[PDB]
Amino acid sequence: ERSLLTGEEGWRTYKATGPRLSLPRLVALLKGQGLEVGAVAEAEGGFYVDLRPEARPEVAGLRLEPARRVEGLLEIPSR
Ligand SMILES: [Cl-]
C-alpha cells in the first residue's frame, strides 16, 4: 500500500475537510484519536493526510475519506 503524496510504502492518503478546519488542527485531532500520521498537504478544497492502511479513523464532526486522486495541492508535502 503506497502514499499518493510521497509514494511511500505503507500509507493510505486520505482527504480531510471540515468547518473551521486547518492543518495543525487536523493533525492534533488525528493524534487525539490514537492514529499514526504520515505526510500531510493542504489542497484547494481541503487537506490530504496519510493514514495507516490498517487504521480505521472516526473523528466526531470531521469527514475523512481515502483519496482516489490528489488534485489541486497548495503546498509541497512534508512532515
Ligand atoms: Cl472495515
Residue numbers in the entry: 425 to 503
Manuscript text:
The ‘heat-resistant RNA-dependent ATPase’ Hera is a DEAD box protein from Thermus thermophilus. Hera consists of a helicase core, followed by a bipartite C-terminal extension that contains a dimerization domain (DD) and an RNA-binding domain (RBD). The RBD is responsible for binding of Hera to 23S rRNA fragments comprising hairpin 92 and for binding of RNaseP RNA. The Hera RBD forms a modified RNA recognition motif (RRM).
To visualize the structure of the C-terminal tail of the Hera_RBD, we crystallized several constructs and mutants of Hera_RBD. Two of the mutants, Hera_RBD_K463A and R444A/R449A, yielded structures with their entire C-terminal sequences visible in the electron density maps up to aa 510. In all structures where the C-terminal part is ordered, residues 493-498 fold back onto the outermost β-strand β2 of the RBD and physically block the RNA-binding site (cyan and orange in Figure 5A), with exception of the wild-type Hera_RBD structure. Although the point mutations are likely responsible for the different crystal forms, they do not per se impose this particular conformation of the C-terminus, and only the far ends of the C-termini extending away from the RBD are dictated by crystal contacts. The C-terminal part of the RBD can therefore adopt at least two major orientations, distended from the RBD or attached to the β2 strand. Mutation of K463 abolishes RNA binding (see previously). For the Hera_K463A/32mer and Hera_1-491/32mer complexes, the Kd values were 1.0 ± 0.17 µM and 1.1 ± 0.13 µM. These values are identical to the Kd value of the Hera_core/32mer complex, demonstrating that the RBD does not contribute to RNA binding in these mutants. Mutants were grouped into three classes according to their Kd values: (i) with no or only a moderate (<5-fold) effect on RNA binding (K439A, R487A and R492A), (ii) with an intermediate (5- to 10-fold) effect on RNA binding (R444A and Y472A) and (iii) mutants that showed a >25-fold increase in the Kd values (R449A, R444/449 A, K463A and ΔC-tail).
